[PDB]
Amino acid sequence: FLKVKNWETEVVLTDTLHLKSTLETGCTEYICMGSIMHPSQTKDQLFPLAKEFIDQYYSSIKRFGSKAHMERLEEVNKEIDTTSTYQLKDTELIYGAKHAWRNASRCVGRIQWSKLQVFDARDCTTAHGMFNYICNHVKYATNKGNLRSAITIFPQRTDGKHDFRVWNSQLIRYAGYKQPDGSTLGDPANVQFTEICIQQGWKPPRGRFDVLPLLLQANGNDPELFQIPPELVLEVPIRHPKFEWFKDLGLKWYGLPAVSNMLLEIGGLEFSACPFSGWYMGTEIGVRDYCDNSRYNILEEVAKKMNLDMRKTSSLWKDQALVEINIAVLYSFQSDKVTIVDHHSATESFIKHMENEYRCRGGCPADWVWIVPPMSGSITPVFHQEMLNYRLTPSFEYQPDPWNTHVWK
Amino acid sequence: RFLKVKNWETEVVLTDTLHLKSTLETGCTEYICMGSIMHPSDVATKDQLFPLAKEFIDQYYSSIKRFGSKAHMERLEEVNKEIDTTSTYQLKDTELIYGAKHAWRNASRCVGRIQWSKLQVFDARDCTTAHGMFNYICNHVKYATNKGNLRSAITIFPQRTDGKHDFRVWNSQLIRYAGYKQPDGSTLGDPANVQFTEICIQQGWKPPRGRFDVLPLLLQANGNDPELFQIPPELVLEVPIRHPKFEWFKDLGLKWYGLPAVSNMLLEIGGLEFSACPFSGWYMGTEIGVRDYCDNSRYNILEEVAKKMNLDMRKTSSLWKDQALVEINIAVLYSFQSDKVTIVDHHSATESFIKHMENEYRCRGGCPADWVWIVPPMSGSITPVFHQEMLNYRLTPSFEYQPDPWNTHVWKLV
Numbered sequence: 052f053l054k055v056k057n058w059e060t061e062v063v064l065t066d067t068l069h070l071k072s073t074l075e076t077g078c079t080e081y082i083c084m085g086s087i088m089h090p091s092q093t094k095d096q097l098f099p100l101a102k103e104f105i106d107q108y109y110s111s112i113k114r115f116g117s118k119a120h121m122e123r124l125e126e127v128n129k130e131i132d133t134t135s136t137y138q139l140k141d142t143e144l145i146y147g148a149k150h151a152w153r154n155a156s157r158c159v160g161r162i163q164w165s166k167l168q169v170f171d172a173r174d175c176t177t178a179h180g181m182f183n184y185i186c187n188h189v190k191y192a193t194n195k196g197n198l199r200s201a202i203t204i205f206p207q208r209t210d211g212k213h214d215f216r217v218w219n220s221q222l223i224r225y226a227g228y229k230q231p232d233g234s235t236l237g238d239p240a241n242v243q244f245t246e247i248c249i250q251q252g253w254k255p256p257r258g259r260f261d262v263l264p265l266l267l268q269a270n271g272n273d274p275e276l277f278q279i280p281p282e283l284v285l286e287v288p289i290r291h292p293k294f295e296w297f298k299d300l301g302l303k304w305y306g307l308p309a310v311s312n313m314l315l316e317i318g319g320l321e322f323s324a325c326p327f328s329g330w331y332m333g334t335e336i337g338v339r340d341y342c343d344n345s346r347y348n349i350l351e352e353v354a355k356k357m358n359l360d361m362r363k364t365s366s367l368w369k370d371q372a373l374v375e376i377n378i379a380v381l382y383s384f385q386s387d388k389v390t391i392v393d394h395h396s397a398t399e400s401f402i403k404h405m406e407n408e409y410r411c412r413g414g415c416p417a418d419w420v421w422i423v424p425p426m427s428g429s430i431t432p433v434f435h436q437e438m439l440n441y442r443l444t445p446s447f448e449y450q451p452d453p454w455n456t457h458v459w460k
Numbered sequence: 461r462f463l464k465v466k467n468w469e470t471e472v473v474l475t476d477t478l479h480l481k482s483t484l485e486t487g488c489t490e491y492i493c494m495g496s497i498m499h500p501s502d503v504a505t506k507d508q509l510f511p512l513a514k515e516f517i518d519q520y521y522s523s524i525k526r527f528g529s530k531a532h533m534e535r536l537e538e539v540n541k542e543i544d545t546t547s548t549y550q551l552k553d554t555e556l557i558y559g560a561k562h563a564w565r566n567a568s569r570c571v572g573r574i575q576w577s578k579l580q581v582f583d584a585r586d587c588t589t590a591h592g593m594f595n596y597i598c599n600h601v602k603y604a605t606n607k608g609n610l611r612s613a614i615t616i617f618p619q620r621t622d623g624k625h626d627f628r629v630w631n632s633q634l635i636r637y638a639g640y641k642q643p644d645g646s647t648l649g650d651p652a653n654v655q656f657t658e659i660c661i662q663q664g665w666k667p668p669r670g671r672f673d674v675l676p677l678l679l680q681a682n683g684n685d686p687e688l689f690q691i692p693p694e695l696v697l698e699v700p701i702r703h704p705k706f707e708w709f710k711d712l713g714l715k716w717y718g719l720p721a722v723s724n725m726l727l728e729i730g731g732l733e734f735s736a737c738p739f740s741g742w743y744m745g746t747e748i749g750v751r752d753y754c755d756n757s758r759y760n761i762l763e764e765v766a767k768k769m770n771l772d773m774r775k776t777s778s779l780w781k782d783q784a785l786v787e788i789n790i791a792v793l794y795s796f797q798s799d800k801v802t803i804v805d806h807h808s809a810t811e812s813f814i815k816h817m818e819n820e821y822r823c824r825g826g827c828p829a830d831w832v833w834i835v836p837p838m839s840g841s842i843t844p845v846f847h848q849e850m851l852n853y854r855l856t857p858s859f860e861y862q863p864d865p866w867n868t869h870v871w872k873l874v
């Protein structure tokens with residue numbers, strides 16, 4: 052029983068959902084870690100986590116206690132006694148993936164949480180199979196431009212030495228090349244991964260927007276390279292609806308944001324390979340990818356073309372050029388009928404999602420630090436929205452980058 | 461135990477040991493974070509005050525490289541007898557200056573704390589009446605304003621005693637504009653201040669009923685009914701907002717006061733509560749151009765600005781709001797600079813806060829900071845603080861929120 056207030060509306064929501072959290076958020080009563088990106092770090096161990104999810108699943112359909120429930124427990128309980136684990140019924144698999152997304156406190160997009168396509172890839176055994184499932188995921192999810200949310204779930208962690216992992220952080224990312232002069236070409240955030248792919252035999256075309264290969268690890272084996280068919284990689288070239296010099300900037304971005312490095316936790320099961328894809332919020336590309344200094348850093352480039360007074364910072368030349376960039380992104384995706392959402396709509400829809408969640412569910416964990424868009428913050432409704440943040444399962448956790456943890460054969 | 465924060469833009473990692481000294485609660489639990497809650501949550505006894513006083517005194521003497529000295533020991537025994545015989549005690553002036561400066565230094569929600577040690581402290585603890593308060597504040601204002609070359613300052617009034625004799629500035633900030641609800645539901649002036657404007661009008665304030673009326677001060681000395689005073693207009697520095705490019709922007713008739721001066725907060729030093737402690741600095745541009753002008757519960761001018769910018773306001777995705785926001789904040793920054801009124805843009809101010817924070821880690825072992833507030837409310841991630849992990853914890857001496865006096869004051873006359 053905890054209240055959260057919206058200061059712009061004076062609307063007030065009561066939160067009971069948080070009482071059903073059990074994972075430490077990293078904060079204590081003495082020190083908040085709300086801006087820390089990574090705050091926290093057998094039989095009588097896995098069955099509790101399994102028992103809880105199944106209990107939770109049958110509650111979402113009122114079969115709480117019914118003989119299937121009581122039997123599912125014993126079925127799961129004895130699978131652990133022999134096979135040291137258990138497998139999720141298809142329904143449970145789809146419920147858990149939709150509910151890791153429902154519980155993603157950092158995701159502004161969760162108004163769509165129940166509209167999730169779940170591709171079960173738990174029979175997969177090789178990287179070539181991993182490539183096939185992902186190729187199908189990307190095609191389905193891209194859908195000619197009318198994007199659809201989707202997750203593909205590979206076999207669960209079995210012993211750690213047989214993890215399925217997508218080594219790319221995202222299914223679709225541009226390469227990053229260290230330069231002779233010491234600078235960088237392409238996406239700098241990816242230089243390390245690009246160098247891994249080159250070391251692994253990828254032939255870099257050494258351009259600004261080179262689509263990285265899929266680096267796929269199945270059953271703990273060494274990873275393997277695959278080039279996604281380019282006809283599956285929808286890209287949008289960035290032009291501006293006013294500045295006709297903007298296309299001259301040579302900018303483009305891919306259309307499909309697809310997170311492949313996170314871990315999906317259902318009932319004590321760890322799916323170390325579970326790429327999930329949505330559609331972009333415009334700011335992600337226009338603010339973070341294009342303007343972050345550690346990224347494509349086009350701010351200075353745009354202002355030069357914009358005539359702005361880059362003398363002093365109080366001219367706000369960065370802010371002005373920033374807005375124009377994000378106009379050009381939103382307008383380029385919509386000109387190509389590729390799904391995209393601006394931060395105004397997306398935050399507005401998230402306010403409504405919060406209302407919905409407090410009403411039907413009694414709460415909705417949200418990370419204000421991540422929900423508020425990286426530009427124009429206070430002119431969006433989530434800025435004025437108090438948010439409780441807490442960790443419900445099923446969930447997407449982070450996990451160590453595989454190369455830091457993989458013994459090569 | 462240490463604690464690491466990383467800057468994700470520069471990969472610099474800092475180590476926080478200073479959190480170990482925090483005491484009051486963040487509001488968070490081990491299972492829930494309240495980091496974005498604005499206010500998570502009669503007077504102390506002898507048995508409470510002793511360890512609070514000894515703690516602050518230990519820290520003051522540890523600050524002046526005099527920990528354990530006889531001055532320190534004598535002071536502790538002096539402070540102890542006072543609490544034992546008077547149930548409270550009185551800060552020396554050095555201790556008040558130190559206490560005020562370190563309450564600003566400990567203010568996690570404040571991005572300007574690089575300036576924390578250049579703070580003019582006005583000891584107003586000899587004040588007994590509201591007229592006396594008005595005189596101390598007038599002096600504060602004139603001093604801080606300095607004909608535009610603003611100087612940080614705090615005026616500190618008698619500490620709380622039993623809780624029934626509090627000093628209070630009912631004004632939330634010393635200089636703010638009146639707001640008037642109209643019969644038709646529209647609001648004239650600043651909508652934020654409409655409840656407070658009514659309170660003044662009830663107390664006898666005759667309101668100009670304009671868009672930019674300076675509210676009277678409403679000053680409460682020693683638990684008594686509060687009393688109204690007009691700040692002398694010559695003492696209220698105001699800036700006409702104009703745009704360097706848009707020659708029509710002056711036609712919006714926007715203006716704002718130069719001195720931001722918070723006066724509803726409670727300054728806590730050594731367990732002593734200074735319920736009236738107006739402090740003042742200089743503005744960051746976004747505070748006026750983003751929150752004051754563009755918040756929808758505020759002056760709410762984006763529409764009208766976009767109109768005259770000929771912006772496609774049909775769909776949000778045109779980013780007409782974002783476009784007009786930048787131009788407003790260009791106008792505010794350009795206007796204060798044109799009249800040589802101290803103001804700081806959000807880039808400069810955040811770049812400086814990163815320097816402060818890093819310096820604070822080196823010399824002090826940490827710097828409690830509230831990311832939700834530190835990040836400017838526009839262009840968040842193109843400012844270095846957005847990529848900067850921060851630890852929030854409450855160090856004392858501290859600035860604290862306190863109940864609005866009109867929700868707690870039992871009136872007296874007729």
Ligand code: HEM
Pocket residue numbers: 151152155157158159160161163200201202327328329330331332335392397421447
């Ligand atoms: C459909 C439209 C969607 C939109 C507009 C959207 C938007 C966003 C944005 C803007 C972020 C933060 C951006 C960043 O920091 O990189 C985020 C985070 C996240 N989203 Fe969504 N999302 C969408 C769909 C999905 C889907 C389909 C899932 C599937 C589970 C999902 C789960 C998550 C998770 C787990 C995070 C946190 C990622 C992290 O910690 O880095 N979202 N979302």
Ligand code: HEM
Pocket residue numbers: 560563564567569570571572573575579612613614725739740741742743744747804809833859
């Ligand atoms: C010297 C220049 C200063 C600058 C540029 C500055 C900037 C800011 C800004 C932008 C905020 C956010 C408040 C809001 O959004 O309403 C803030 C908060 C705050 N500042 Fe500073 N400030 C300055 C001086 C001071 C001084 C002199 C003190 C006290 C001695 C102080 C104590 C605080 C406190 C306690 C808060 C929290 C306000 C609250 O919680 O409502 N600041 N500051």
Ligand SMILES: Cc1cc(N)nc(COc2cc(CCN3CCC(F)CC3)cc(F)c2F)c1
Pocket residue numbers: 160220221223224307308309310327328329330331332335
């Ligand atoms: C499901 C979904 C929908 C949506 N609309 N967006 C996303 C997020 O996808 C991405 C995020 C990033 C930034 C990652 N950033 C850097 C530090 C760490 F790597 C984590 C934070 C780059 C990128 F290329 C992306 F595709 C996911």
Ligand SMILES: Cc1cc(N)nc(COc2cc(CCN3CCC(F)CC3)cc(F)c2F)c1
Pocket residue numbers: 572633635636719720721722739740741742743744747
């Ligand atoms: C010393 C100092 C320096 C500085 N640069 N800024 C400040 C902050 O002072 C102010 C803040 C506001 C907004 C109040 N804000 C709104 C949400 C709720 F009402 C909580 C409070 C209006 C105003 F007129 C101010 F002066 C103080």
Ligand SMILES: C[C@H](O)[C@H](O)[C@H]1CNc2nc(N)[nH]c(=O)c2N1
Pocket residue numbers: 058434435436437438496497498832833834835837
């Ligand atoms: C709900 C949220 O805490 C609230 O809108 C906060 C967010 N961050 C802020 N940051 C600053 N500087 N000033 C504010 O008033 C706020 N408001």
Ligand SMILES: C[C@H](O)[C@H](O)[C@H]1CNc2nc(N)[nH]c(=O)c2N1
Pocket residue numbers: 085086087088420421422423425468846847848849850
């Ligand atoms: C330090 C800070 O926690 C970090 O930079 C966060 C802030 N908020 C964010 N919000 C979003 N949406 N995405 C991010 O990557 C981040 N980064």
Ligand SMILES: [Zn+2]
Pocket residue numbers: 078079082083084085486488492493494495
């Ligand atoms: Zn917290």
